[PDB]
Every structure is written in C-alpha cells, then in structure tokens.
Amino acid sequence: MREIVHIQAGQCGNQIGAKFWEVISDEHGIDPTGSYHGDSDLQLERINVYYNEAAGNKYVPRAILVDLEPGTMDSVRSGPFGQIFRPDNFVFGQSGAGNNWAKGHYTEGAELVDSVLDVVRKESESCDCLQGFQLTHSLGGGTGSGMGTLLISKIREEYPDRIMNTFSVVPSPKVSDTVVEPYNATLSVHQLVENTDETYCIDNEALYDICFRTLKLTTPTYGDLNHLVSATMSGVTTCLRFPGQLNADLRKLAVNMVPFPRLHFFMPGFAPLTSRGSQQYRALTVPELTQQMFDAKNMMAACDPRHGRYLTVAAVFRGRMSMKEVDEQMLNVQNKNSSYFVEWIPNNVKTAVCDIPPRGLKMSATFIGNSTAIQELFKRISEQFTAMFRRKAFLHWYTGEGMDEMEFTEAESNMNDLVSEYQQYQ
Amino acid sequence: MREIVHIQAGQCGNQIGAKFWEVISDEHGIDPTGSYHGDSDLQLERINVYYNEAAGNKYVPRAILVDLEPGTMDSVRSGPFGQIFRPDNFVFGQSGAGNNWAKGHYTEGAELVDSVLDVVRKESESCDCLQGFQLTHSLGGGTGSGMGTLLISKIREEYPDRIMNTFSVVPSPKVSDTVVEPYNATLSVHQLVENTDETYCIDNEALYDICFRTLKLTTPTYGDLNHLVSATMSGVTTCLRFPGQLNADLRKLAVNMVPFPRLHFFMPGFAPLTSRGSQQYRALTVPELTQQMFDAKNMMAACDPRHGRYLTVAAVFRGRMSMKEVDEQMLNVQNKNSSYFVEWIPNNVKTAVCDIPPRGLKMSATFIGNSTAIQELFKRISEQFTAMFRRKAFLHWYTGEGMDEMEFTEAESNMNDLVSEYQQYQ
Amino acid sequence: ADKQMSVKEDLDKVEPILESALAALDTLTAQDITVVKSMKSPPAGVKLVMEAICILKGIKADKIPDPTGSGKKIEDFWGPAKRLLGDMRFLQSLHEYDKDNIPPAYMNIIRKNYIPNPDFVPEKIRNASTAAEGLCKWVIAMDSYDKVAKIVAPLRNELQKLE
Amino acid sequence: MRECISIHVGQAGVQIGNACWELYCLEHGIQPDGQMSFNTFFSETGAGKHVPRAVFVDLEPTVIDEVRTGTYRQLFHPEQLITGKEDAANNYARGHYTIGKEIIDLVLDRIRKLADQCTGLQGFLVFHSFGGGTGSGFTSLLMERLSVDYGKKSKLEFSIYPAPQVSTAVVEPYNSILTTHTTLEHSDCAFMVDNEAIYDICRRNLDIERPTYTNLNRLISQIVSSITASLRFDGALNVDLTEFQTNLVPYPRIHFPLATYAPVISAEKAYHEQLSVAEITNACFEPANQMVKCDPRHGKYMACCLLYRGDVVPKDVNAAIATIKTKRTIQFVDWCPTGFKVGINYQPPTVVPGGDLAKVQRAVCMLSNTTAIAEAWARLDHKFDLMYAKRAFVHWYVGEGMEEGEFSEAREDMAALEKDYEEVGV
Amino acid sequence: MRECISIHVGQAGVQIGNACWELYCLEHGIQPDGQMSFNTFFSETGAGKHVPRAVFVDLEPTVIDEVRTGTYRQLFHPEQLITGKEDAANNYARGHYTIGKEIIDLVLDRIRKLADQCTGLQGFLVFHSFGGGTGSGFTSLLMERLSVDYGKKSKLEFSIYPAPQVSTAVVEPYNSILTTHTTLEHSDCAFMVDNEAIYDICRRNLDIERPTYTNLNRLISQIVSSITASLRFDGALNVDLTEFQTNLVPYPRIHFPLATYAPVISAEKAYHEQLSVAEITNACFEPANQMVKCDPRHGKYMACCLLYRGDVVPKDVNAAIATIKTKRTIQFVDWCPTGFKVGINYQPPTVVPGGDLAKVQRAVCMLSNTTAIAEAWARLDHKFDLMYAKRAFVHWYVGEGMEEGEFSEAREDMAALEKDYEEVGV
Ligand SMILES: Nc1nc2c(ncn2[C@@H]2O[C@H](COP(=O)(O)OP(=O)(O)OP(=O)(O)O)[C@@H](O)[C@H]2O)c(=O)[nH]1
Ligand SMILES: Nc1nc2c(ncn2[C@@H]2O[C@H](COP(=O)(O)OP(=O)(O)OP(=O)(O)O)[C@@H](O)[C@H]2O)c(=O)[nH]1
Ligand SMILES: Nc1nc2c(ncn2[C@@H]2O[C@H](COP(=O)(O)OP(=O)(O)O)[C@@H](O)[C@H]2O)c(=O)[nH]1
Ligand SMILES: Nc1nc2c(ncn2[C@@H]2O[C@H](COP(=O)(O)OP(=O)(O)O)[C@@H](O)[C@H]2O)c(=O)[nH]1
Ligand SMILES: [Mg+2]
Ligand SMILES: [Mg+2]
C-alpha cells in the first residue's frame, strides 16, 4: 500500500529522474530489462511503492516523463535504463519552452497537460492506495517551472488529500546558467509555496562543493551531481519501501518537519560523503554519519546553515544501528549547536531508523533540515529578479504569452512574504 | 443448432466479409483448403453455426457473396481464403451499381436478386435450425445500399421470425469518399430502420483513430481496418459458437440492448487495442479491458459517447475470468459514468462471459453500446443530404431509375424521426 | 437632499455590516485558511462553513456515487469545496467577490439555518478552528451584506430618482 | 423410502446441478461412473450403476452439451437431459408461452416416469433463476403442470434472486416479477439466494479474491445438502421436507426463508479456530453471513430452523439458542415465542476436492424467515416501476404471447405481499 | 478460569508484543508453531496449536507485515492481525477522528469475538505509546469503546511515555497530552515506562554498550510477566489485576505506578553475586533502577507493590521490608502506614534465548506509585506550552477533525492532576 506516482519535467527533472530510477532499481534488485534479479526478499516485499509488475515478472516504474521538446526524453529512451520506461510514460510535444515560464504554464504546456493528466489518471486508478506524487522539476528552466507548476496545480485539484513532494533544483546565484533564471524561479516559487507539502531545494553549487571537496571529483559529471540527488530521494522514501525500527512515512516527515503551513522548504543532505579510498581513514559509526550530515560541506542547498538556526530536523538513517546510539548522539548535537537550533520547538531533531542499508554501505544516513537560513537563497533570487524588473527587462517574451506586470509584482510579494516569516521565527 | 446465414454485398461488404471469414477460420482451426487442423475440440463442437461439413471433412461457410460487378468478387476468388467458398455461392451480374442506390435496389440488382434469394433458400433449408442472417454491407455505396437493402427486405418477408443483423459500414462526415454518399446513406437508413433487428454502425474514421493512436499503425491498410471489424463480429457471435459461464445468443443481445422497436443501432468496440510491444506496458486484467472498452478511442463509431449517455450496454467478454471481477468492475463503471448512463434503465450494463479466448490473447472483450449520442452521426448525414437536396442535386441519376422527390422527403422524415426519439430518451 | 442624507445615514447604520463583510474579507488569514483547507476533513462546522462558501460562490454540490445500501447518490458539497479552496487565488477570489453579485438562492440556503446556527455562530467556530473564524464570519457577513444590498440598494435607486 | 426429484431449469439451474450432483456422489460414495441407502437422490440401476433421480432442462442446448462431455456425464441416463431448439433469451414470454409450450410436454413425460419409480415420492426441488429467461416462465409453467398433477406433494425452489446492485441482464427486473406472480401460488417453499451476498461471503470469510461461478455454486449446493441429509441420513430430531413447509410457513402465503451456511472456512482458518457448536450458531445469525443482500436486523425473524450436522450434541445446541434468545438485538416476533426447530444429523458435510472449504466437523444451515426480506422486494418493485414507466422492452414480451395487464397485476400482487409482511411485523 | 486479553497498538505496541509473546511461549513451554494451565494468555484451539488471546493493530501495515513473516507468525491468529491503509503519521487527529473511525469497528469485532471465548474475562492490557500517532488517539478511542461495552472489566496500560530528553518525534509533546485527557478517565491503571531510563538501565547494570529496541523491549516485557504470573501461576499471596487497581489506587484519579524489574544482571554479574531475596528488594528501591526518568526521593512513595518470583520465602521478604520502612530517607505518604502488598510466586522468570539476562532465581517487579512522577508531568506540560505558544503544527491536527480548545482543556486537566498530587504529598 501507499504507492507513489513519480513525475519528471524539463531536461533537469528528466535527467535527475533518469539517474533516480536507475538508483532505486539497483536498490530493489531490478535490472535494465525490468526483470528482478535480487537476493533480498525485502525488495519485493514493498516493490509496490515504486513499480507496477506485469506478465512474466516485468517490473515498470509508476513514472510519467514530460518534456515540451522530444529530444531529452528521446535520449532517455536510448539510455540503458530508458527501456524500463513505457511510451505511455513518454508524453511530449515538439515546441521547446526555451526557458520561458509562460511557454511552460500558459501556452505550449497547456496544450500538452491534458494528455499528461490522462496518464496521471491512468496511474492513479492503477494504485492499490495512492500516497503521493514526486515531481523532479527545475525551478529556473522552462519545462520545469511553467509546465511543472501547471502540472502540480491540476494534480492538487484532482487529488487534494495526497502528498505532493518536489525535489526542485533551484538557481545558484554564484553559477547562473540561464537568462531569466530569476523570472522563472520567482514565478515558480509563487505557485509552489501554495501547491506543495514539501519541497527539497537542491542547487548545483552545493553539489559541486560536495564533489570537489569531499568526493574529490574535480571533474563533476552531471551524472555525479545527479547520482547525489538520486540517493537523497531514495533515502527519503526508504521507510515506506523497507521495514524499520522506526518508520517515517512521507506524511510523517512532513508533519514532523513543518511548524507552519507555508515553511515547507527543506535542505537535504547525505552521508557518508567520501572519495574512493578516503574511506580507509574512516570507520562507519553513528557519530561519524551525524557529524558529516550536520557539516556545511554536506548540505545540498545554497544557504550556510550557521547563517540561521534549523527550525526542525529529520534524520532518516539507514542500515543496522542502535536507536540508543542515534538518540544519545543527536542529543549531544542539540546541545553543542545551541545557537543553530530554534527554541520554539524542543526535540528539534526527529530520528527514523530504516533497517535496510543502501546495498554496499554498511551504514548510511539522509538529512532533512528546515533552516531559517534558507531565507538567504530566496533573498538572492528576489534581489536578482528585482533589479531586472526595475528595467522591465525581457518583459516582451512574457507579455507576448499573456502575462502581466501585476503578476510579477505579486510574485515579488510572495518572495517578500517568504523571507519575513523566516525572520520572525529566527 | 441456431445456424447463421452470412451475406456480403458491395466491395466494402465483400472485403470485410473476406477478412471476416479468414478470422473465424483461424478461430475454429480451419485452414485455406477447408480442412480442419485445430487442437481445440470446442471449435468443432459448434462448427455448425458458421460452416457446412461435407465428404472428406469439407468445411464450407454458409456465406452468400453478392456484387453487381464481377471484379471485386473475382479478386475474392484469387485470394488465399477465397477458395474455401463453394463457387456456387458467388452470385454476380456484370453491370456496376456505380454508387447509385437506384441501380442497386430498383434496376440492376432487382435482376440479380431472385438468383441470390434462391441461394438464400438453399441455405435456409440446409440448416438444422436457422437462427439469423448477417449482412456486411456498406451504407454509402451502390451494391451495399440499394442491393443490400433490397436483399434485406425480401429475406425478412421470407423468414420474419428470424434475426437480421447487419454490420453496416457508414459514411464518415470528415472523410467522405463518394459523391452521393448522403443520398445512399439516407435512402438505405430509411429502409434499414424498419427491416433489421440490430445494426452495428462502423465508420472508417473511428477505425483510423484506433489504428493511428493505439495500435500505432500510421500506415492503415484496408486489411487492418477490416481485421478490426472482423474481430468485432467474431466477438458478437462467440457465445453461440463456444460454451460459456453466461451465454448471449444473438436474440439475447438484441433483447438486452433494445429499449424500443426502433433504436436498434449500436456502436461496437474491442479490447485490448494495443500496438506490438505496446501491449507490454499493459497487463491483461478485467479492469484493464473494461477501461479500454469504455474509452472513446476504442469506439468504432463517429459519435463521441460523452456527447450523450449510453441507453444500454452489453459487454461480451472472452477468455477465463471471474464473473465476480467483471460484475464488481462494471458496477464501479456505472458509478463513475453517472452522467453517461441513462436513468430509465438500472443495471444499464449486461455482462456475458464466453469461456473461449480468441486464440492468442489470454483475455479479450467486445463492447456493444447503444448511445443517444449516435444521433449526431444521423444529424451529420441529414445535414449533408438536406443541403444537396435544396439544390435538387444529382437528382437526374435517380429520377432516371424511377425514383421520386417525395421518396427523398420521406427518407428525410425517417432521419428526423430517428434523431427526435434519441433526444426524448436523452 | 435631506432624504439623500437619510439614505446615507441608513448606509452609515449599514456601513458597519458592510465593514463587517470587509473585516471578514480581511480575517481571511494568509495561509492558515490555506492549510485548514489543504487538510482533508476539518471540524464539520468548518465543513458546513466551506459548504456555505460554496453556496456563496454559487458552485453546486455534486453527487457522491450511491452506496449499496442507498440507491440515492449522497449529496456532497465538500468536493466542490475541495476544488474551490484548491484554487491558488481562492482567498483572492473571496476578496474579489461582490455583495451585489450574490444569488438570492445562496441567501435562502444560508440565512435560515447557517446564519442562526449555534455551531456556525463565530464563538463555536472560534473554538472549532482559528482559521475558520474568518470563513464563518465571511459567510455570515456576506449574507448580511446581501440582506443589506437587497434593502438599501433599491432604496438608494429610489433616492436617486428623488435626487 | 422417502424419495425425491431434482429439476434443474435454465443455465443457472443446470450449473448448480453440475455442482450438486458432484457433492451427493462424494457423500454417498458414488463415482462419476455411477459405480460404487442413497435412495432419496440415487435410484439404483439393474446392476452396480446408480442413476440420479434428476431432470435437466434448458432451451439453450449449449449448457447441457457441456454436461454431456464433462466427467459428470455417464453418471446420468440421457433419459434426463432434455434439449430445446433455441434459448429463451431472457424473455419470460418465450419460456412460458412459446418454446415452453412445445418441449414442456416431453419434460412432463420424463417427470412422470421418474415419479413412477419413487415408492414414497416425498417432493421436488426446482433450481431456477428469477431473472433468467428459461427459469422465469418455464419454471412457472412446469410448477403449474406439477401442481395440476400432484398437488399434495412437496415442492421446493432454490431461486437465484436478482442482486440489487450486481448486473447480469437488462430485462432481469421484469422476469422476477412475472415469476413471482405465478411461483408464489404453487411452490410451498422458496429459499432464495442472490449472487452478490454469496460473493461477499466468498471474499471475506474464505479470503478468496477471484470468486468464480463454480465456487459460489458449491456454497449454494452445500445449503441443500444440509436440508436433505435429514432425509438422506439417520440421527436425532430428523427433519422432512414437509416439516420445513409446516415449520417455516405460519401464514400460508409467506414462505421465503433465507439460508446461510456456516462455517465458511478456508484451509488456513481451520487452525486459530475451535469450530465449537455454539461458535457456529452465532456465525449463522451474523448480518454479513446471510446468503441474501438483506440485513436481518431491519425487521424480525418470525420462524427459524437450524440443521446441524456431524458431531453435534443437542445440549450444546440448546444453550447456544438460550443465548441467542437472550440477545435483545436479534428481534423475534411477539406472537411466536420459540421459533426454532433443531435437526441433528450424524452425517457431517463432506467437502468437494479442489474447493473453498476445509474439514468442518460441525456445520449448520439456518433457514430463517424474516420480515426483513421485504426490503429486497421493494427495491426490485422500484427497478421495475422505473423501467415500466418508460414501458421499455415491452415489445419483446408482448409479441411473444403476453399481456401488458399481466405486468400491472404482478405489481399489485407484490404490493399485497409487502403489505402482508408489514402486518406480520406489527 | 481468570483469563485475559492483549491489545498491541501502534508500532511500539506491536514491537513490544513481538517480544511479549516470545516470553510467554518460552514460559508456558509453547513452540512458535503453537504446538506443545496457560488459559490466561493462550486459548487452546480445537486443532491444538494453542493460539494467543491477543489483538494486533496498526495503521502502518509495515510493522505487522514483519510479524507475518517472523518465526512468530503461525503463533498468531489470522484474525489477531489487523491492518489499516495509511499510518497515523504522529497525528492524534488521524488516530482518533479519521483512520480510527474506519478500522476501529473491525477491531471492536475481533475484541468481541475474543471476549466470547473467555469464561472469566479478567481484563485487558493495552500496549500503546503516549507519543506515537496510532497509540495516542486510536488507543484513547479503543479504550472509550471498551468502557462503553464492559465498564466493570479490568484495563491496564503499558504506556511508552516521552523521555524528557531523548528525541523521536517533533509533535511528540502534543500527542501525550491529548492521550492523557482521554486515557486517565478510562484506564483504571497505567504503568508508564520511558525509553531513556531503560537505556540507562541497559548501559549500567548489564554493561551493554549498544542498547537496541529489542533488548529494551525484553526488559519491558518481563515487567508484565511478573504482573501476570500471579494469575498465570500458583503460590502464596497470589495477586490479581483487580488487586493492583484496588491496592495501588487509594484515590481513583491517581493511578500511575512506576515499575522496576530487578535483578537486571548479565552473564558475568551472575557470579560476583549471590542474588538474595533482600538484596533484590534494595535494588528495586534504587533511584537509578526506576524505569522512568524520575527520582523517587523528590516526593513520597504513595503506595508500593512487590511481586517476587521463583524461590522466594515470605520471612525473607518481611525482614527486607522492615529494613526499608526503617530507612527514613525513602519517604512514604502520610495517609497509609503499611504501603506494600507482597505476592510470592513459585514460578521463577525464565529468560529469552539470545538476550540481556541470565538465570536469576529470585526477581521482583516493584510497581510503586509516588508523587515524584509529578516532575515528569510538569516537564512535558512545559514542552507543550512552549510549542503551543507558537501554535506550531496546529494546522496538521485541526484539519483532521480536532478542536483548538481541546488543547487548552487538556492542559487544564494536567494542572488539576498535578494539584491533586501536591495535595496527596502534603
Ligand atoms: N449461481 C449462478 N447463477 C448463475 C449462473 N449463470 C447465470 N446465473 C444467474 O442466472 C441469471 C442469468 O440468466 P441465466 O440463468 O443464465 O438464464 P437462463 O435461465 O439460462 O435463460 P436463457 O439464457 O434465456 O436460456 C442471473 O440471475 C445470473 O446471476 C451460474 O453459473 N451460477
Ligand atoms: N520500546 C519501544 N518504543 C518504541 C519503539 N518504536 C517506537 N517507540 C516509541 O514510540 C513512539 C514513536 O512513535 P511510534 O510508537 O513508532 O508510532 P506509532 O504508534 O506506530 O504511530 P504511527 O507511526 O503514526 O503509525 C516513541 O515514544 C518511541 O520511543 C520500539 O520498537 N520499542
Ligand atoms: N543537477 C542537474 N541540473 C541540471 C542538469 N541539466 C540541467 N540542469 C540545470 O537546469 C537548469 C536549466 O533548466 P532546464 O530544466 O534545462 O530548462 P528546460 O530544458 O527548458 O527545462 C540549469 O540551471 C542547469 O544547471 C542535470 O543533469 N543535473
Ligand atoms: N472498412 C472498409 N471500408 C471500405 C473498404 N472498401 C471500401 N470501403 C468503403 O466503402 C465505401 C463505398 O462503398 P462501396 O461498397 O465501395 O460501393 P460499391 O463498390 O458500389 O458497393 C467507401 O466509403 C469506402 O471507405 C474496405 O476494404 N474496408
Ligand atoms: Mg441460458
Ligand atoms: Mg507506526
């Protein structure tokens, strides 16, 4: 029971999703042909969540692939794990959003949504009991922002009682990649704040930091960055998919992580983040993992944590460990970082222990933090956006698609509202 | 017992019939030579319905082939399955109807009918117990409309107590093929309404839709369209020909499907409609099949179902399934389509479960719907016709054959009568 | 002119109830409403209140698929409510709603039962949900304002004729 | 000896028969070959073989053809298996007036021959369906004939009643009502089971997720076996067919007892159970375990009978009954204080190879009249009223030797019945 | 006989159950198979395989799924194990109002069935957690239902209380308080153990550096075994469930005894020890050995009870108690002079293979009510006040069928409780 409906929108969404599926496949013993060849019974105990099995032990993800262009999703198909996806999943048009929110939401993507929603409906009724919808969609692109956001809205109208979680890849102010990245992000966020229960905000900057420093990969492939995010999402959903000493449902995490309706944004991490052959100087222990997780170098978000205080924390560990050890370990942690844990909430941390390791690490962990500090990320984008709006810049592309200045002003208001609330609960 | 006398009239009738016979042959284990080489005893348990046996295990369809021209029926002969017919069963003249109703009914076909009726009489007397007459005849042609309709009338006079069912291929307003298609259809329908118990209305448009979208054949051969209709008719008559958990006679279907004398027109479908390798992504279940059947893409009629409400429904499934599953499944369906099931009749659906699959699909289904929506099909043709009658167009071809304006007015009245009745029971 | 001033005094007497409707619009909190609505099945009182909002909006209750027990399809107004609330600009839409543009049908539904109900009365709603206070107030105040448009608007038009 | 006659009518009847005669054989110890005091249901042949004292009728030869090829084939003497030309096609007017008044006389012949065999002809059992075409008119016709012939003899009616929700056939509602008009004034007793309730029982208590007709049928058949075994076997308190009639019919008009067989227990549910005598009594009185879609609490049990089998000791039974009387919930009628008869038979039920049930040492078929069945009557009256407002499918019936006025009178009768039950409840 | 019911609710409850039913089996001599007077906790089934008189409920199916595959599997009834769709996700408003008022009725059914088995139903044991989602609302709901049903019957509550320091879940504080509101006015007695104190006991007395949930649980379970064994076994001074209620609850409202099992002694600590009767008494009264994070010296032992097992001779016990009374440090409440009951049971505790403890000939579970638990109440009231100042996570609960006012009233109740304890101390 409690099955999840995956979604991948935009090149970024589509590629992280690509690597994401591959990752979980290996975790559940599924090979490229959609056949099971795993020695762990526990994999197929709850295969349900992430895979719909058919005739002859074919195993197929509950995943919908959306791209306003054909190309990136055709690369998907060519890919090794691409064959496990269905054509039913591959739903595309042939007009590119071209990093325009208005193309994604209003125009090109409004034409392609109904078809996608039909596939959504196919995938909802095929569920024993639908739990949630995971959407991997960039904030700063065209097919992630507009098309992604539109998809979220309609889906929430259809199934309002269910979980909507989005591992949304956000702009990094220091490494901007696109023109109107500010425009895309701001318009996206305005909608996202109101349309999702939880959003895991991952910027490329932080990923690079991790790769360079810790994993010691000074040639990051998008593959490597993707591999990172993939493992993050796996960890989030391990509990549903495997037995545990304490088991955290997606709703459980949300409920434990959220002081208020609005402030649902999070920073995921992972441990152990080490290079190959940089594990022999180490020894895998609960303290080790916690220390790694609570370090700034192992945050997959823009904000430095220490520029604020974690409102809440939820550390979903994996592999075979003493609850006592974890308890005792994360009590110390509460005490040490007195400055960086919010007062409002005692027992800031929330520890969930899945009994399954990630097939090759004897222990592992996955952080989820809600920090007041992430206000800084929003500030950066607000600033970037604001300056360009002062010159009414790039306006013509958006006004061309029906969008209005007042909308943008309202999107700015949304951003302002988000940052003030964090300040209040600093 | 309960044997059926097939008929094929006009190129269209003759060709669907061609493919139809081939289809059933394979279902009953009969090869091109009229010899049985099947491993299923059940095939020859009720071979009767559709074949006469003679000396040396002869297998002869009780089918009469009619064409006012020799050519299409000579192609039949040349064909692989063509040589299964007893050559005495091809009754032809050498003057083409040339898409003239008046040539088919009044003139050229009145000359060739008596000979055909003699062959009809042969067949009726060779029956252990005649059940019905299946006529595959186009509405919009010359040899289907006039000649077909004339054949129906005389046969009904001869055997009024028996079943007359006609898988009549109708005009598609969006893909007109012939000049006076309106004229042919309107004159045909006028007669058909009063002369048949049940008529399965199949337009080429819908077939194309199926092929293109679902079967993913973007090169439809008339072969493929024909293969479709063929399977439809097989499904209709599976019950008579094979044992079942609940068995629906042709009369049974008619009786279950018809609220009133007149509104006997139907829309057939089929499932599972999938492309090769497309099937893959599906997994054959009762719910799957029902969902496919009740989808608009798997309707072999012009009308969108949702532009109206099904008066009645009769889903004749095939292969080995749980009556409970079907029952429970189609109860949900009643609930889901609250707006597209007519109130008058509770238990709108009628489930019949044949115990025989169609030799290569573990499960299968065949829909028969009576929708108020099909009024739209009649409207389109009425409109098309009416405009041309306003200019008294093409009149000379028909007046030349003895036909009169008043007749046409009366045919218009027939059409009007058909559409009003559906409106009343909307 | 004095007659005009008298109708404008009528309005001044009515201005607080118009102000009450405005205050109801205001009492629509940022995202507490947004979340009480995000949650599936809040206190029935608030479910009545959002049903009242649905009627206010003019959106009709749908039919729940009939259970085995009962042939009749259950009358459900919460699903319309679910979609109505779901709208991102729903709160904005409440702010946009006009007293003049109120179905008299809605007043019939709401005033009679919902306006004089004890659970629907703000005190119980204050208990029921802090977020719902606004919503209940909104429905009540909207009805009072359509009570008020119905009585003062034709009078003001008659006054305009006098003017 | 006390000896009986079986009459399976319609597809439903015959299918149940297929199941029934399996059971009896397994119990009495007869092989399908007929080779081995069973007097009641087997008449011994010349040597070795035993022949079922049964009648097998269907207008649809399809059904009984399956009989003729089954392993249950040589068990019957094809004196029994009667065939008709064409099926009643869910028309009551074909079952009664047309195809009935043709083959009925042949059936009356076989009946009479079988009657002559019986030294002590006890009575009859008539497996039909209120809502098949065959069993709706034909059954009534047959009943009428037998009443004229015998009158005094015992007549029983295992009637597959329409499930208020579950859908088989569109005209189903008309058929039931016409059957009731005619049946209630012939059959002294009528145990009515609907499929939906049986399906409920299949899913819940036996944990079976695919309820086939076969399994549902075995359950139906075991209900009879218990009714019989008092005749078929020794033991304390043995009941007779006449005894039910006498017991269960305080008012000569109302005789529609519900049945319910417990325990309904799978291979698992064997263990983690104690199968005690009093356990099984409670189970029988359960609102869910009823074989109709009726809640017994929505009225009063008027008279009840319980037919314990296997290792049942009367003292155990008497205490359970005390308990039952104690519970105020389970309402009884004011005017009859003790509304039970208890029959204890040393023979336990013996369960069919490849089936639902496991070895239950104790079992009990409770045949209980209630005023609560008046709910299922009302529902069906309503379904009929709705369609007969429109006068739908009127044409089929009328043209087959029926009266429109017959439909009106039938309802009147139903109103009277309902009124009677209301009186009784008061 | 005196016979009992087990109810494991929530993940915590079920885990404890997993441990509990192991122990009982090892004691009574039952295998996991169910094969071998244990009347109290095993109901000897017909087939044999003595099966527990237990109920196992969780909304999170994950937990009980682990049960269904464990070696402890064929021990439990199919009925024993009940599943829900989705987990309460640390919401009291989902445990009580939503998913509770759905599956509760099914559970009430199983309870009632089990109730019927018991000749002499003694009472109930309810393993839940004040601070899980399931066990916080659902438990309260269940309790309420059972109070309405039985009332007079005995109800016991092994409540995993929040450790003031140790962290599991963020909303944990809210849950406890809502539970208390409802629980205290149903459960006549509530033995509350927090994990932190148990962990302390694990580290110090057993020298275990990795306290897993399993080990903590075995300790929790042995506390019960002693409470029961007076029912389960022979011996002088045997106590009953009702006896605790009566003896330990002079004031009806205050029924929160602490527990403490000694000796808590490893394989080593067996030697370097002689385990005398009076040694073990002192150990029980130890401030550190308490199973709660409460210092007993910070108030007065209101009432005490001691449940010696194995080779205990009363004279030994009486002298130890004299000694204890002598010590002026260990304070007792004014109202009662002699605040002990002593139960001596000839059965010694028998320890679980692969576990903490070694063969202790003598053991004693002291269930001792003190005013000192008012410290742990205050702490938790404070935690709640802090978060409810902010009104944090208010949204989750409200939207799930709750009252904000319920939170206020709950505190009021707590204030009253605390005041009562203060009065008692005075
Ligand atoms: N238990 C059971 N009921 C059946 C079975 N087949 C049909 N029914 C019921 O019978 C009714 C449907 O009509 P049938 O009984 O098949 O019809 P018939 O009496 O054979 O009449 P014709 O088909 O016209 O010859 C409904 O009440 C069905 O649920 C079966 O195998 N088992
Ligand atoms: N002794 C013990 N306590 C546990 C265990 N698991 C959880 N707990 C305690 O239970 C509370 C945490 O919530 P759970 O009991 O897991 O939650 P639940 O009752 O299953 O509710 P849901 O998870 O929402 O279904 C805290 O008090 C934990 O310390 C366990 O295995 N043993
Ligand atoms: N982590 C990650 N980010 C990517 C990848 N590909 C593109 N992106 C980011 O996506 C952002 C642009 O949005 P994109 O979704 O490509 O626009 P679209 O193609 O129009 O949807 C850039 O900031 C890229 O850094 C990838 O494989 N991994
Ligand atoms: N489905 C189908 N339709 C056909 C085929 N051949 C012709 N038709 C249709 O038949 C219609 C014309 O009638 P036709 O019977 O050919 O006229 P005739 O040759 O004078 O009888 C056209 O609308 C064609 O689409 C075929 O093989 N399959
Ligand atoms: Mg039949
Ligand atoms: Mg849980």
Residue numbers in the entry:
A (entry chain B), B (entry chain D): 1 to 426
C (entry chain X): 70 to 232
D (entry chain C), E (entry chain A): 1 to 36, 48 to 437
The authors write:
The dynein family is a group of minus-end directed microtubule motors. All dynein family members share a common architecture, based around a heavy chain that contains a cargo-binding tail region and a force-generating motor domain. Dyneins bind to microtubules via a small microtubule-binding domain (MTBD) consisting of six short helices (H1-H6). Nucleotide-dependent conformational changes are transmitted to the MTBD through the stalk to modulate its affinity for microtubules, allowing dynein to bind and release as it steps along the microtubule.
DNAH7 is a monomeric inner arm axonemal dynein closely related to Chlamydomonas reinhardti flagellar dynein-c. It is one of five human axonemal dyneins to contain a flap insert between H2 and H3 of the MTBD, and has one of the most divergent MTBD sequences compared to cytoplasmic dynein-1. We therefore made an SRS-fusion containing the mouse cytoplasmic dynein-1 stalk and the human DNAH7 MTBD. Following 3D classification and refinement, we obtained a 4.5 Å resolution map. Namely, the majority of the MTBD remains unchanged, but H1 and CC1 move up into a raised position over the intradimer interface. At lower threshold levels an elongated density emerges from the DNAH7 MTBD and contacts the adjacent protofilament. There are two contacts between the flap and this protofilament, corresponding to H10 of β-tubulin and loop H6/7 of α-tubulin. As such, DNAH7 contacts four tubulin subunits at once when it binds to the microtubule. Aligning the tubulin of the DNAH7 and cytoplasmic dynein-1 models reveals that the DNAH7 MTBD is tilted relative to cytoplasmic dynein. Based on our observations, we propose that the DNAH7 MTBD induces a local flattening of the microtubule.
